[PDB]
């Protein structure tokens, strides 16, 4: 009923089993999207995490860190945000989610809620409940909202609008939320795409967390000649591909990232993840000075 | 030719150095690349190297074909 109604407005979105996904072109109202997600199903968000990762090899500890992160998200009740399902770190997150549900079940659940574009994915049957068979997708994620309107070769088109939604939810006010009406929001960095999304995050006044071989490692090292030295140390091959002027653009982006120290937070080499997240949140709550009184 | 550089370090039982030099993020590898190295790794009783190969995306059930078991 309501679903068939929505298709007309968008100008099709069933469930795949072998969750529910929806297709939207672009410029959709963020308020309408959140309102629809709440109206149809789901519930309010005590705390939601966002992560930006593009293949990467997992390390013996990184798995522990992210498993702990997902366990905390389970404990509190949270939404996670991921981009697409290109296998790698995000696929590992999906696997951890799937393991957690069967491990515990009982009360509550966690949502991955991944976001990506129409074009990058392979063709699939269009509606009611079309089946799907495996540029590629992951089975673990519960729902993925579709973006990028009409494209076939456009890369990373959705990456813009995703950040937009990341900004909206914070603005929404809920009385007696335990955070004075402002739902918390935290960014976790695992490369270049994460760098740009960090600048967007900071411009949106969102605290971010960075692990103690990519831009994130350069940020940790930081803790002109400075930028170039850290860039050369972090990744020999990556810098060579980028042109000389692209390095000036990188200088500008790194300056933007370091502009405000209070919002950003850094981990240091079992509860380190929880402590870092809480610390990040606390710094934002302290900057305003309205919480001080 | 990172494969030969890896073979030499596989001969002598050296893990800590090998991880760093041959298993950084810049270069990539797949199971098809590592099958032969895995075979010898098993034969010569090099356990920690089997751990290192399994961590970095080696599908073990796919590697064990009946011919390899016969061998």
TrEMBL record, chain B:
Chain ranges of the TRPM-like domain: 21-71
Coiled coil: none
Cellular location(s): Membrane
Superkingdom as given in the UniProt entry: Eukaryota
The protein, known as: Transient receptor potential cation channel subfamily M member 8
Species whose genome carries this gene: Ficedula albicollis
First-to-last residue of the parent protein present: 448 to 518 of 1115
